């Protein structure tokens with residue numbers, strides 16, 4: 001398991017959490033020095049539990065699929081909540097079985113469905129450590145519309161930060177003041193599968209992407225990533241989605 005506490009949190013303690021989150025994900029191989037997530041894990045070992053504590057010390061436990069860093073569901077007191085998708089229903093066979101009741105959320109966990117449920121795109125939803133504190137608090141008591149926004153915050157401040165050093169740093173910059181994600185953050189989130197694939201395809205193609213990945217950079221400029229010498233590959237991405245899952 002991994003844990004993060006909002007009470008007394010700072011960029012350093014958050015960085016330690018994201019480090020722990022990354023290190024909890026198993027891999028037997030690195031591709032261009034980046035850990036390659038496993039094709040599959042059977043049974044309960046598929047799911048990492050993240051214990052998150054809001055500023056007041058109230059807690060939720062979030063179940064994360066260790067092969068793709070997808071959040072499947074979470075436990076809040078004696079109620080479990082799972083996304084309305086087959087992978088999450090499968091997770092519900094293994095985690096939070098002791099919950100007195102299980103609620104299936106009225107949406108799947110993908111950005112597009114969550115944004116529809118929330119009533120806004122995540123371009124308009126501030127993120128940061130304060131937003132994470134709010135998100136945890138919101139998830140404590142069932143409200144499906146509120147929860148959708150909270151989950152958009154939760155996913156980006158945990159999984160996406162684990163996947164990209166840039167996103168982790170963006171949240172560290174938002175330790176005491178929320179701000180909507182940079183266009184670069186959004187671009188990286190949207191391109192994780194694509195980048196993961198092209199980095200793996202580069203292995204037998206002399207470090208060269210079979211298909212370029214278009215990204216938005218720090219300055220708001222759209223750029224093309226064509227090979228493994230790119231800063232996105234050498235410094236930024238921290239976890240690769242296995243091509244078997246793409």
Ligand SMILES: *[C@@H]1O[C@H](CO)[C@@H](O)[C@H](O)[C@H]1NC(C)=O
Pocket residue numbers: 208226227228229230231
């Ligand atoms: C590979 O990407 C680097 C970094 O962006 C770029 O400067 C260069 O033109 C590309 N090199 C090759 C061989 O494709």
